[PDB]
């Protein structure tokens, strides 16, 4: 399927144990997609002071359209030293590995895969 319904655990930035997906734009997009498929991907909501506490390159989920079955349609955009790889809508948050942190909420998304 071109899209997959996912419920992403929303993590507090200070709880996150693994603060990025790797060391290159291509690697972080690769790893983000693998973790989304394996159900091992978390979401951190972006506010003042969040991104400097995480590791670049960043992987964002961005709204790709204006929400089937309550799932917002999203795609992946990476960012490294202020340059983004991909073009999309509003940021829903930054993706990180999930390694058993307790979430505060869930974010239902339809991931363009």
Swiss-Prot record:
The segment(s) forming the CoV Nsp1 globular domain are 2-113
Q: Where in the cell is it found?
A: Host cytoplasm
Region feature (Disordered): 1-113
Describe the task this protein carries out: Inhibits host translation by associating with the open head conformation of the 40S subunit. The C-terminus binds to and obstructs ribosomal mRNA entry tunnel. Thereby inhibits antiviral response triggered by innate immunity or interferons. The nsp1-40S ribosome complex further induces an endonucleolytic cleavage near the 5'UTR of host mRNAs, targeting them for degradation. This inhibits the integrated stress response (ISR) in the infected cell by preventing EIF2S1/eIF2-alpha phosphorylation upstream of stress granule formation and depletes host G3BP1.
Q: By what name is this protein known?
A: Host translation inhibitor nsp1
Organism per entry: Severe acute respiratory syndrome coronavirus 2
């Amino acid at each position: 399927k071109t899209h997959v319904q996912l419920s992403l655990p929303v993590l507090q930035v200070r709880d996150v144990l693994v603060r990025g997906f790797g060391d290159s734009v291509e690697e972080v997009l690769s790893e983000a997609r693998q973790h989304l498929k394996d159900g091992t991907c978390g979401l951190v909501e972006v506010e003042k002071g969040v991104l400097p506490q995480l590791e670049q390159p960043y992987v964002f989920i961005k709204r790709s359209d204006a929400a089937p079955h309550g799932h917002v349609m999203v795609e992946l955009v990476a960012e490294l030293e202020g340059i983004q790889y991909g073009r999309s809508g509003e940021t829903l948050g930054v993706l990180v590995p999930h390694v058993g942190e307790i979430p505060v909420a869930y974010r239902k998304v339809l991931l363009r895969k």
